[PDB]
Write a sequence for this structure.
């Protein structure tokens, strides 16, 4: 898939997922809306994703079945896209 073996983004997604969704064991592919017994917090997660990954994904899309491997794949896609010129991309884009 469009993922990297060591994702600095996904690592944190997997961490804040268990925190915001309100579950104990959050694994890589967990349907977030399914694991949460208080799904209203899905909006909190999405709002969190702004400051944390510089890319937000609104509840309707996030809760649609985007797991840590899915949401973060888009995050690394953002980092795959031209990042701040101070070498924040890692993956240099070819336009």
């Amino acid at each position: 898939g469009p993922m990297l073996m060591n994702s600095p983004l996904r690592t944190t997604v997997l961490d804040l997922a268990r925190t915001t969704l309100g579950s104990a064991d959050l694994t890589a592919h967990e349907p977030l809306a399914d694991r949460c017994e208080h799904p209203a917090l899905l909006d909190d997660l999405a709002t969190t994703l702004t400051a944390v990954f510089a890319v937000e994904i609104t509840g309707a899309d996030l809760a649609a079945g985007a797991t840590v491997a899915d949401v973060a794949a888009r995050m690394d896609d953002r980092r795959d896209a031209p990042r701040i010129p101070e070498l924040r991309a890692g993956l240099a884009p070819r336009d």
Remarks:
- The first helix runs from residue 8 to 21.
- The CA atoms of residues 24 and 37 lie 12 Å apart.
- The chain has one domain: 8-80.
